[PDB]
Design a protein around this ligand. Sequence first.
Ligand SMILES: Nc1ncnc2c1ncn2[C@@H]1O[C@H](CSCC[C@H](N)C(=O)O)[C@@H](O)[C@H]1O
Ligand SMILES: Nc1ncnc2c1ncn2[C@@H]1O[C@H](CSCC[C@H](N)C(=O)O)[C@@H](O)[C@H]1O
Lengths: 602, 617
Amino acid sequence: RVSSGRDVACVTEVADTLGAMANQGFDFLCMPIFHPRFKREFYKEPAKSRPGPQTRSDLLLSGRDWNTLIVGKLSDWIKTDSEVSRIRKTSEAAMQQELNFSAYLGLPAFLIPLKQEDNSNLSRLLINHIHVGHHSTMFWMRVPLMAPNDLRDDLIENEPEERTWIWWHNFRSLCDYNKKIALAIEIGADLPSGHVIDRWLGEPIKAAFLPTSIFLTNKKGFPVLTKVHQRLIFKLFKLEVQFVISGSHHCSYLQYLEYLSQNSPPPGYEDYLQSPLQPLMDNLESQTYEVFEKDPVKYSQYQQAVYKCLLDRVPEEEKETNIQILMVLGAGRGPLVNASLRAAKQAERKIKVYAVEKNPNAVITLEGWRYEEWGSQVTVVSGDMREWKAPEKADIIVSELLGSFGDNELSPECLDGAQHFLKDDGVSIPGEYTSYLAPISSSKLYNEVRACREKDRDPEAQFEMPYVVRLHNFHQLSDPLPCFTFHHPNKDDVIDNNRYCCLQYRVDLNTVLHGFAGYFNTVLYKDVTLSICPESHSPGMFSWFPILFPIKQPIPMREGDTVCVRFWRCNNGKKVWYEWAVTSPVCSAIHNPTGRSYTIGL
Amino acid sequence: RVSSGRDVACVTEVADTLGAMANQGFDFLCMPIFHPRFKREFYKEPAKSRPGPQTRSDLLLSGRDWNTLIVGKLSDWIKTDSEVSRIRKTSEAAMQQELNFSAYLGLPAFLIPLKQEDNSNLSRLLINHIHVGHHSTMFWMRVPLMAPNDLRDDLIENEPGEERTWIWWHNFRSLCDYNKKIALAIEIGADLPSGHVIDRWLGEPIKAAFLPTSIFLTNKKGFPVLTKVHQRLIFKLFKLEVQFVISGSHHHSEKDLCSYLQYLEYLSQNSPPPNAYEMFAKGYEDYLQSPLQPLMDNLESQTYEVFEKDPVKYSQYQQAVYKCLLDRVPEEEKETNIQILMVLGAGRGPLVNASLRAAKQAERKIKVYAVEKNPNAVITLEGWRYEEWGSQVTVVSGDMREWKAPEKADIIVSELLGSFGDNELSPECLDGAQHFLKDDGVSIPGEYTSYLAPISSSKLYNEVRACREKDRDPEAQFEMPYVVRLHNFHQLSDPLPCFTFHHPNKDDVIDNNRYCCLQYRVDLNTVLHGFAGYFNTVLYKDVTLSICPESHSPGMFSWFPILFPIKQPIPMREGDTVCVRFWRCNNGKKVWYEWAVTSPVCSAIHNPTGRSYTIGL
Ligand SMILES: Nc1ncnc2c1ncn2[C@@H]1O[C@H](CSCC[C@H](N)C(=O)O)[C@@H](O)[C@H]1O
Ligand SMILES: Nc1ncnc2c1ncn2[C@@H]1O[C@H](CSCC[C@H](N)C(=O)O)[C@@H](O)[C@H]1O
C-alpha cells in the first residue's frame, strides 16, 4: 500500500520534524545523525581538541523510534577515496565514527552515497565495520541511475548509461555481495534503456529516491510523472520497494504514488531455490501432489493424448467389441487415471485400466476411487513398475515421471523395466522427451548457490548439484541446444541410459558464465506436446520450472568467444547422476565426478 | 645413479623379458597387461561370449615384482573419445577393465597416452576410477613434446604452433581438477620446442621421460649419441630426478640397449655444475610456508642458524657501520669521540660482531648495546658477553619499544626485514625505539620499500588450494601470504613500489596504515593467480640490499619472495590492465594486509579485517 519516506538535508528539530512528516503521510525519515556541515579534525591541534558534543544524543528519541523511524545519512564531506592523503585519513576516521554511531542507535538502515567509480577504500571500511561485531544494520547504497555529469545542462562551451552500473557492481563485488548491503536507486530526469532498468531491478533494491524536481505540474497545479517514469514506478511496485521523497516542497506527492497504485496494470516462487524432487526415491507428500495436480494444462494434454491414441488403433466396427488395456504407470492420487477414463468415454471406446504405484500412501488414495467411483475396470497395483509381473500385456501405457530436465526423475529407467509387459505394437505415452541446455549469466543465483554451504560435507558440494530456479533470475546467453533424448518404447539393440554430448554456443556480448539453464520438451502423442523451452509457444510452459547446473569458477567472457560444455549422464546400476565440465574459452574441472555431490536414487 | 626403464611393444615370455632387461641395466619394465592387438567385444554376440582368459594371470610374478618392477600400458585401440558411439561405448568398457586390473596388480604406475586435444571422456573415466576407492597407482600421461603431425616428413604434395600438445596436457589436467595421482610422462621427439616451452613442461609433475631409439645418432665408432640440443634437455631432466624410458628397437645402432644406458650415465657424470641454482637445493624448490614472525614468536636456535648462513647480509651490514662511523666522526676525533651504537634485535650475536669489527676497520671507538626480547637468544648473547666482548657491550633483555635507554644512541642497527620488507613489523618496532635515538642519529637500515608484481602460476595456486585446514574458513588459505620461490611462478609485469618506510620517521603523526593502487599492462594471454612481493632496502648511503627481480644490488639470494594468492583466478587477454588495491592495516593489536583486484575483472577484498591472516603486535 505504498510505504514512503522523507529525505531531508538537515533537521533543526527532530521531535518536530517527525510529527510534521507524519502528518504528511510519511512512514520513516532519512536524516543525518551528524550535522552535514559539522566537519571535525582527528589528528591536528587545536581543532582535534574541540570541546562539546559531536552530535545530538540518543536520548532525543526512544529506542523504538531509532529502530523503526530513522534512516541515518552519511556526511557528504566524507571522501574515503580522495587522492589527498590527509583527506583520506580524516574521512576514514569520520567514516568509522558515523558507522559506529548508527549501530549504537540501532538504526534499521544507513545511507551511504556512491558519487564515483572508485569506492575501494569505502568498501574496505564498510565490510570491516560489518565484520567487527556491529550488526542488524542494513546499508542502503544511494546510486543514481544516471551520472550527475550526464544529467547536467549543456552550459559549458569548453566542455559539452553503463557508468553508474559499474559503480554499484564494482562496490558490491568488492564487498563480496554482503547480505547487509542493499541498493537505493535515485531517479533522474532522464532514464536509461529498458534493459538496463530491468538489470537494476535484479539487484537487491530496498528503496527508490524520487527527486521533487522530476515531477511535472499539471493543469490544476498537481504533481505528475511522465509515462516513462510511470512504467518504472510500476516495476518498482511489484518489488515492494520503499519510495523516498527528496528535494524542496516547492508535499503530498504520495497521493500521485497511491494514484499510480490503485490504478496499476495487473500481472511468489521467484526467489525459490531448492534441489529437484526425486519421486522415485522418495514417497511424496499429499501436499506435494496437490501442486502437481493444480495445473490444468498437464491434465488437458494428457487427456488429448489418450484421446487420439485410441482413435488410431481401434475403428468404428470395433467401437464396442475391442477392449484396450491401458496401464497408468505412476498413477499418483488419481488424475492420470481419471484423465484416461474421461478420454475413453469422450470418444466412446472400452478400456481395461491398471493403476500401479510404489507409494503406499498414494495407493490408499487410489483405493479410495477404487471402491467409490471407478469400479472393477480399474485394477489397483501396489508396487514398483520394474518388478511387477503383469498378468496381461498392455496396449497403452501412460506415465508422468518427467522432471525439469526431463529425465532427472529417472523416467527412462522406470519405463525400461515396465517395457516387457507392453504389446509388440503398443504405444507409450509419452513417446519421447528431450532435455535442453543453455549458457546463462546470473550473479544473483550464483551467490545464492554459493551461500548453500552446509557443514559436515564438501564446502564446494553446492556447486556440483542442480537446482530448480526461475527464468527471470538469470540472463540467457545463448539459445538452448538439445542435450539428451529418450524414446519409449526403446527398441534399441541394448538399453543404455548413459549419455554424453558436447554443446557449443557463441558469445555475442561481454559477460560472465555462471552456469547452465536446463529445459525439456516431450511428445505425449503425435501433435500433442508439452514444452518449457523459452522461445516456444507450446503448452506446458508454466508446468515446470527451469533447472540450473551451476559452475564453481565463474568465467568472464569476451564477445566472439565460444562455450563448449561437456555433459554426461551416468548410471552405475545403483544411482544415476550428471557430470558436466566447461572446455571453452577455458577448461574447468569436471563437476560432480562419480556423483560425489549429487545422485538420484535407483 | 640413473634409474631407467624399458618400453616394450609386446611381451611373449614375461619372466624372460624381465631378466633380459635387468641385465641390460634397467630398473623397471613398461609393458601392457593386455595384448595390444587383443581387441574385444562387450555388447554384441557372438564375440561377446569369448571363452578363455582375458589376459595372463597375476601369479606369474610375485606381489613384490608387480609393485616395483612393472609399469602397465593401456591398449592403443581403446579410443574413449571417438565420435562413433559404438567405438566409444566399447572403449569405455575396455578402459575400465584395464584400469581395475592394473590396480588389482598393485601397479606403481600406469601408462595412458594422449593423442589428441579432446580427451574429455578420458578424464571422466580416469577420475572416476580414482574415486571408486582404487588408488595408490600413479598415472603417467604420455604426452609428446611435439605432435606426430608436426614431426612427420613433408612427403605429401597435396598436404604440406608447437604449444599444440601442451593444450592436450593442460586441458586434461584441468578437467581432472589437478589430481595428485596424475603425472606427466613426456615423449621426446627429433625436434624440440622453444626453451621457454620446455621450462613450462618441466614445471609440471614429470615422473618419466621417454627416449626413442630413433633420436640417437650413430657415432663413427657405432655408439648411440644424442645431439647437443637433446643433451641440454637431458641435463634439465637430471635435476628433476625423473626416470628415463628407452622405446624402440636397438637395431638402429651397432650396439645393444645397454649402450643407451651407459651414454646417459656418461652424461650424468659429465653434466654441467649447477649454479644460480643450489642456493635453494636440495631443496627449498617447492617451498610453500607461512612467513615467520620473529616478533610474535621466539625463533629457535636452528632458525637463527639459517638466517646467519648468508655472508652477504653480514658483509653489507658490516660495510654500512663501516661507512657510517667514518662519516659522523672525523680523523682528529679518532679517540676523543665514542659513538653510541645500539644493535636492536641482536639475535645470537652476528650483528654485534659485525659492528665491532666495523669499528676496528674504521679505527673508531663504539659503546655497544645489544638488546633482544627472545630470552633464549639472550642466553647466547651473554655467552659472547662474558667470554669475548666485554664491558663495552651491554646485553639487554626486553622489547625495544618498552626498554628505557639510560643513554641516547648515535647509531641504531636492526635486521627486522621480512620477504615483503615490513611484514615482520620492522616499522612498529623501530618507531617505538626511535625516542632514545639522538636528534642527529643514524638508523640502519635507513629505509626500505616493498614491491608487487602480477604473476601466473597454476602450480602455486593448486598448492595453496590444497592448504585447506579443518576447523576454519575453507577459503582462508587464499587470504594469506606465502613464502615461495621464483622459478615456481611466471611474472606478468615489472614490479611496482608498494609501501616505503624510512627511519627515523620524522612525520607529524606516525601512521603505518598504507594504501596504494598499482596498475600493470598485460602483454600475453594468461591467468592471474596472485602477486609476488619483493623488497629493497638502504642500510647506509649507497650500501643496499634487494631481492627485486632485475636488481644489480647484492642480496638476491638473501630472501625468498612472497606470494599474495587470489581466490578466483582471472584469465586475461593482452592489452588488459591490472589494477590492484593493496592495504596495510594496523589496529593497535594486530597488523595485516588486505588486497583486491579491480581490473580487468573486479574481485573481492581478500583478508578483510585480518580475518584469515594477521601479524602480532
Ligand atoms: N518405479 C515406479 N513404480 C511405481 N510408481 C512410480 C515409480 N516411479 C515413480 N512412480 C510414481 O510416479 C509419480 C511421479 S509424480 C511426478 C510429477 C512430475 N515430476 C511433475 O512435476 O508434475 C509418483 O507419485 C511416484 O509414486
Ligand atoms: N620489538 C622488539 N624488541 C626486541 N627485539 C626484537 C623486536 N622485534 C624483533 N626482535 C628481534 O630481532 C630479531 C630479528 S631476526 C629477523 C631475521 C630476518 N627477517 C631474516 O629473515 O633474515 C629476532 O631475533 C627478534 O628476537
